[PDB]
Amino acid sequence: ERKYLELKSQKNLYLARLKSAIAAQKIEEIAGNLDNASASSLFERIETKILELEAERELLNPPPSPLDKKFEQWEEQQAVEATLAAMKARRS
Amino acid sequence: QEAPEDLLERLLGEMELELIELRRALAQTIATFKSTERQRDAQQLIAQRWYEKAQAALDRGNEQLAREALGQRQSYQSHTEALGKSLGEQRALVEQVRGQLQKLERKYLELKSQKNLYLARLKSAIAAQKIEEIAGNLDNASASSLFERIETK
Amino acid sequence: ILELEAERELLNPPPSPLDKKFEQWEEQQAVEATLAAMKARRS
Amino acid sequence: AALDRGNEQLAREALGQRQSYQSHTEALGKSLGEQRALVEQVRGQLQKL
Amino acid sequence: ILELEAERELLNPPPSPLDKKFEQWEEQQAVEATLAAMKARRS
């Protein structure tokens, strides 16, 4: 009788360890499914879909060339300069 | 294949069941641990009571009866030493096990915190590719779509 | 009762024994400071 | 307050305890900064949208 | 439990013992620096 209850006393302890162990391997398995490139999973594998879909947007409508960026930036800086230059000169 | 994003809600939702499932069991361990603690004290008190009887039995010059009582106490004492050893070993596990879960809870919510952020990006991305797809359906001759293809009619 | 009681501990962890010492130590000085000034205030 | 009255041993434990919290402050603060660009950037497309 | 526990190690390798020394060494100086300035700040 004493031996039987002793085994039952320790029975639930391992169940907690195994169930925690079962959860322990599940948590990092799910975290592994959302880890860095070492696993290449959803958290990093779904953002790729954003990029490829984003890349598609570029192909359909090509972005303006960097030359025009300089043109608009250069002219706008002179455009604002011309407006303020005449404005401050207009002040007197 | 099922939508990967829908799983994230299910995985964390399913995981949350595991968390509470894990947490409930942890309570069972401590309660059983506390119970075993009571038995050691209860049996020790019995041994102490046996010692008290030995003191009274030893008094009045009757030593033969005391010897039997002392021998009887040894049987109980064996359990005290044996059970006490078991209690000490379990202390590390009950303390250690809480450590993983304590880190687990913080980690779990952190993943859930960032879960909705990507959903916004993807849903915006889904809309982002839809808007220029519709605009592409109404773009210039580069696509030759309704906005330019209906005027041909 | 114990396992349900154990659950209560897990949900809201009890304060660490360090704070018990902090409150006990400061309170003993806090009461000491109040009574020390009070008895000194008597004269 | 613990450092006061010449009790330095207790202060060391408190300072060590603060480090655990401080780690989260640094860690969480880094995450907040990264998200700032996305929340600002995302509104840009919709504003044009 | 061990083999499943061993799997956890493989998926996410634990930090090397070198960093343990780095954090332990710097933290001991970090707390030392804070308390050294704190006690010096006392006077």
PDB file of N, CA and C in Angstrom, chain C:
ATOM      1  N   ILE C   1      -9.016  22.792  -2.896  1.00  0.00           N
ATOM      2  CA  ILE C   1      -8.792  24.123  -2.338  1.00  0.00           C
ATOM      3  C   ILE C   1      -7.358  24.564  -2.601  1.00  0.00           C
ATOM      4  N   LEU C   2      -6.402  23.659  -2.384  1.00  0.00           N
ATOM      5  CA  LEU C   2      -4.997  24.004  -2.576  1.00  0.00           C
ATOM      6  C   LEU C   2      -4.697  24.300  -4.040  1.00  0.00           C
ATOM      7  N   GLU C   3      -5.124  23.416  -4.945  1.00  0.00           N
ATOM      8  CA  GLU C   3      -4.832  23.616  -6.361  1.00  0.00           C
ATOM      9  C   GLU C   3      -5.504  24.882  -6.878  1.00  0.00           C
ATOM     10  N   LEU C   4      -6.762  25.104  -6.490  1.00  0.00           N
ATOM     11  CA  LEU C   4      -7.412  26.371  -6.807  1.00  0.00           C
ATOM     12  C   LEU C   4      -6.693  27.528  -6.129  1.00  0.00           C
ATOM     13  N   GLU C   5      -6.283  27.335  -4.874  1.00  0.00           N
ATOM     14  CA  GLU C   5      -5.473  28.344  -4.199  1.00  0.00           C
ATOM     15  C   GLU C   5      -4.147  28.542  -4.918  1.00  0.00           C
ATOM     16  N   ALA C   6      -3.535  27.450  -5.381  1.00  0.00           N
ATOM     17  CA  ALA C   6      -2.295  27.567  -6.137  1.00  0.00           C
ATOM     18  C   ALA C   6      -2.511  28.361  -7.418  1.00  0.00           C
ATOM     19  N   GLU C   7      -3.659  28.166  -8.071  1.00  0.00           N
ATOM     20  CA  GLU C   7      -3.967  28.942  -9.268  1.00  0.00           C
ATOM     21  C   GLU C   7      -3.978  30.433  -8.963  1.00  0.00           C
ATOM     22  N   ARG C   8      -4.577  30.820  -7.834  1.00  0.00           N
ATOM     23  CA  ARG C   8      -4.599  32.229  -7.456  1.00  0.00           C
ATOM     24  C   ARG C   8      -3.190  32.802  -7.403  1.00  0.00           C
ATOM     25  N   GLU C   9      -2.239  32.035  -6.869  1.00  0.00           N
ATOM     26  CA  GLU C   9      -0.860  32.506  -6.810  1.00  0.00           C
ATOM     27  C   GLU C   9      -0.299  32.741  -8.206  1.00  0.00           C
ATOM     28  N   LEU C  10      -0.565  31.821  -9.135  1.00  0.00           N
ATOM     29  CA  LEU C  10      -0.003  31.938 -10.476  1.00  0.00           C
ATOM     30  C   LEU C  10      -0.552  33.159 -11.205  1.00  0.00           C
ATOM     31  N   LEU C  11      -1.865  33.377 -11.136  1.00  0.00           N
ATOM     32  CA  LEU C  11      -2.464  34.499 -11.854  1.00  0.00           C
ATOM     33  C   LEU C  11      -1.864  35.824 -11.401  1.00  0.00           C
ATOM     34  N   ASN C  12      -1.836  36.057 -10.092  1.00  0.00           N
ATOM     35  CA  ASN C  12      -1.262  37.273  -9.517  1.00  0.00           C
ATOM     36  C   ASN C  12      -0.127  36.880  -8.583  1.00  0.00           C
ATOM     37  N   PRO C  13       1.123  36.901  -9.040  1.00  0.00           N
ATOM     38  CA  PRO C  13       2.232  36.484  -8.178  1.00  0.00           C
ATOM     39  C   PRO C  13       2.272  37.311  -6.906  1.00  0.00           C
ATOM     40  N   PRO C  14       2.509  36.686  -5.756  1.00  0.00           N
ATOM     41  CA  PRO C  14       2.583  37.445  -4.506  1.00  0.00           C
ATOM     42  C   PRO C  14       3.827  38.314  -4.475  1.00  0.00           C
ATOM     43  N   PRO C  15       3.829  39.382  -3.681  1.00  0.00           N
ATOM     44  CA  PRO C  15       5.026  40.228  -3.602  1.00  0.00           C
ATOM     45  C   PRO C  15       6.226  39.435  -3.110  1.00  0.00           C
ATOM     46  N   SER C  16       7.398  39.786  -3.628  1.00  0.00           N
ATOM     47  CA  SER C  16       8.616  39.088  -3.265  1.00  0.00           C
ATOM     48  C   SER C  16       8.937  39.320  -1.789  1.00  0.00           C
ATOM     49  N   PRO C  17       9.664  38.394  -1.160  1.00  0.00           N
ATOM     50  CA  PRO C  17      10.035  38.602   0.249  1.00  0.00           C
ATOM     51  C   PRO C  17      10.893  39.833   0.464  1.00  0.00           C
ATOM     52  N   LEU C  18      11.564  40.328  -0.579  1.00  0.00           N
ATOM     53  CA  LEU C  18      12.384  41.526  -0.433  1.00  0.00           C
ATOM     54  C   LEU C  18      11.534  42.721  -0.022  1.00  0.00           C
ATOM     55  N   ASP C  19      10.397  42.920  -0.695  1.00  0.00           N
ATOM     56  CA  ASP C  19       9.537  44.050  -0.359  1.00  0.00           C
ATOM     57  C   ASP C  19       8.976  43.921   1.051  1.00  0.00           C
ATOM     58  N   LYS C  20       8.654  42.700   1.484  1.00  0.00           N
ATOM     59  CA  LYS C  20       8.233  42.489   2.865  1.00  0.00           C
ATOM     60  C   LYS C  20       9.255  43.072   3.831  1.00  0.00           C
ATOM     61  N   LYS C  21      10.537  42.802   3.585  1.00  0.00           N
ATOM     62  CA  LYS C  21      11.589  43.398   4.398  1.00  0.00           C
ATOM     63  C   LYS C  21      11.618  44.912   4.235  1.00  0.00           C
ATOM     64  N   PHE C  22      11.471  45.402   3.001  1.00  0.00           N
ATOM     65  CA  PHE C  22      11.480  46.844   2.777  1.00  0.00           C
ATOM     66  C   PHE C  22      10.363  47.524   3.558  1.00  0.00           C
ATOM     67  N   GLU C  23       9.128  47.043   3.397  1.00  0.00           N
ATOM     68  CA  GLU C  23       8.010  47.649   4.113  1.00  0.00           C
ATOM     69  C   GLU C  23       8.168  47.482   5.618  1.00  0.00           C
ATOM     70  N   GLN C  24       8.566  46.289   6.064  1.00  0.00           N
ATOM     71  CA  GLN C  24       8.752  46.060   7.493  1.00  0.00           C
ATOM     72  C   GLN C  24       9.860  46.945   8.046  1.00  0.00           C
ATOM     73  N   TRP C  25      10.977  47.042   7.323  1.00  0.00           N
ATOM     74  CA  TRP C  25      12.093  47.854   7.794  1.00  0.00           C
ATOM     75  C   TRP C  25      11.726  49.333   7.813  1.00  0.00           C
ATOM     76  N   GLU C  26      11.161  49.836   6.714  1.00  0.00           N
ATOM     77  CA  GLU C  26      10.817  51.253   6.647  1.00  0.00           C
ATOM     78  C   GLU C  26       9.693  51.596   7.616  1.00  0.00           C
ATOM     79  N   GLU C  27       8.693  50.717   7.737  1.00  0.00           N
ATOM     80  CA  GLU C  27       7.588  50.987   8.651  1.00  0.00           C
ATOM     81  C   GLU C  27       8.078  51.086  10.089  1.00  0.00           C
ATOM     82  N   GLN C  28       8.976  50.185  10.495  1.00  0.00           N
ATOM     83  CA  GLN C  28       9.532  50.264  11.841  1.00  0.00           C
ATOM     84  C   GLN C  28      10.280  51.572  12.052  1.00  0.00           C
ATOM     85  N   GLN C  29      11.015  52.033  11.040  1.00  0.00           N
ATOM     86  CA  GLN C  29      11.635  53.350  11.127  1.00  0.00           C
ATOM     87  C   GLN C  29      10.596  54.453  10.965  1.00  0.00           C
ATOM     88  N   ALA C  30       9.593  54.228  10.113  1.00  0.00           N
ATOM     89  CA  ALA C  30       8.548  55.227   9.921  1.00  0.00           C
ATOM     90  C   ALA C  30       7.803  55.492  11.223  1.00  0.00           C
ATOM     91  N   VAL C  31       7.376  54.427  11.905  1.00  0.00           N
ATOM     92  CA  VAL C  31       6.742  54.598  13.209  1.00  0.00           C
ATOM     93  C   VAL C  31       7.744  55.163  14.206  1.00  0.00           C
ATOM     94  N   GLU C  32       8.989  54.686  14.152  1.00  0.00           N
ATOM     95  CA  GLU C  32      10.022  55.207  15.040  1.00  0.00           C
ATOM     96  C   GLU C  32      10.230  56.697  14.807  1.00  0.00           C
ATOM     97  N   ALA C  33      10.291  57.110  13.539  1.00  0.00           N
ATOM     98  CA  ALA C  33      10.465  58.525  13.234  1.00  0.00           C
ATOM     99  C   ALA C  33       9.286  59.344  13.743  1.00  0.00           C
ATOM    100  N   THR C  34       8.065  58.847  13.542  1.00  0.00           N
ATOM    101  CA  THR C  34       6.888  59.581  13.996  1.00  0.00           C
ATOM    102  C   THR C  34       6.858  59.684  15.516  1.00  0.00           C
ATOM    103  N   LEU C  35       7.064  58.562  16.209  1.00  0.00           N
ATOM    104  CA  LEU C  35       7.047  58.593  17.668  1.00  0.00           C
ATOM    105  C   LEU C  35       8.262  59.320  18.225  1.00  0.00           C
ATOM    106  N   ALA C  36       9.419  59.194  17.569  1.00  0.00           N
ATOM    107  CA  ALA C  36      10.607  59.907  18.028  1.00  0.00           C
ATOM    108  C   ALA C  36      10.383  61.413  17.984  1.00  0.00           C
ATOM    109  N   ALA C  37       9.803  61.907  16.890  1.00  0.00           N
ATOM    110  CA  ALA C  37       9.467  63.323  16.811  1.00  0.00           C
ATOM    111  C   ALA C  37       8.315  63.671  17.741  1.00  0.00           C
ATOM    112  N   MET C  38       7.361  62.753  17.910  1.00  0.00           N
ATOM    113  CA  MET C  38       6.225  63.017  18.786  1.00  0.00           C
ATOM    114  C   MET C  38       6.673  63.152  20.237  1.00  0.00           C
ATOM    115  N   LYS C  39       7.454  62.188  20.732  1.00  0.00           N
ATOM    116  CA  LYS C  39       7.938  62.276  22.105  1.00  0.00           C
ATOM    117  C   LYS C  39       8.874  63.462  22.283  1.00  0.00           C
ATOM    118  N   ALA C  40       9.722  63.734  21.289  1.00  0.00           N
ATOM    119  CA  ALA C  40      10.535  64.943  21.328  1.00  0.00           C
ATOM    120  C   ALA C  40       9.660  66.188  21.274  1.00  0.00           C
ATOM    121  N   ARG C  41       8.600  66.153  20.462  1.00  0.00           N
ATOM    122  CA  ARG C  41       7.665  67.272  20.414  1.00  0.00           C
ATOM    123  C   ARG C  41       6.973  67.478  21.755  1.00  0.00           C
ATOM    124  N   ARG C  42       6.901  66.432  22.582  1.00  0.00           N
ATOM    125  CA  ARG C  42       6.249  66.563  23.881  1.00  0.00           C
ATOM    126  C   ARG C  42       6.955  67.587  24.759  1.00  0.00           C
ATOM    127  N   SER C  43       8.278  67.678  24.658  1.00  0.00           N
ATOM    128  CA  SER C  43       9.050  68.629  25.450  1.00  0.00           C
ATOM    129  C   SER C  43       9.698  69.675  24.550  1.00  0.00           C
TER     130      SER C  43
END
